Design a protein around this ligand. Structure first.
Ligand code: CL
Ligand code: ZN
Ligand code: ZN
Length: 145
């Protein structure tokens, strides 16, 4: 995740193993219940797309629900791309590129790119956008049961 230190410096840290452990245990008890959503949010403050994927990867042992979630992510990512069809290059040399849907979902962007977006002034909040897609997904799974 990205944390802000006392000087206002945004600093990246790798995801906590204790965070992953708590997430797996949460899902063991509440996988199909509405509380899985605020617990996901509780455990992902400042999370990068890469963090979010690492979290999903640990609960990968659910198959059908995870397929549903991956479908919702792909849907939302398509939708992002339709609203923001990528240009051939950035506005000028030195500028970050605009994220595509797969950049937000962390499958075609590097952690360095994610950090660059998230620490922009003001933030290009790719972790929060992805979290929204994941939550929409978790919501469908709990509705479905
Ligand atoms: Cl990376
Ligand atoms: Zn452009
Ligand atoms: Zn800018």
């Amino acid at each position: 995740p990205i944390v802000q230190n006392l000087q206002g410096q945004m600093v990246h840290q790798a995801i906590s193993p204790r965070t992953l452990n708590a997430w797996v245990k949460v899902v063991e008890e509440k996988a199909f219940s509405p509380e899985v959503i605020p617990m996901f949010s509780a455990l992902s403050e400042g999370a990068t797309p890469q963090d979010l994927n690492t979290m999903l990867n640990t609960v990968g042992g659910h198959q059908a629900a995870m397929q549903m979630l991956k479908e919702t992510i792909n849907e939302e990512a398509a939708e992002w791309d339709r609203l923001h069809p990528v240009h051939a290059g950035p506005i000028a040399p030195g500028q970050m590129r605009e994220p595509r849907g797969s950049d937000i979902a962390g499958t075609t962007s590097t952690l360095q790119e994610q950090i660059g977006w998230m620490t922009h002034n003001p933030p290009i909040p790719v972790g929060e956008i992805y979290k929204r897609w994941i939550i929409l997904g978790l919501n469908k799974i709990v509705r479905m049961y």
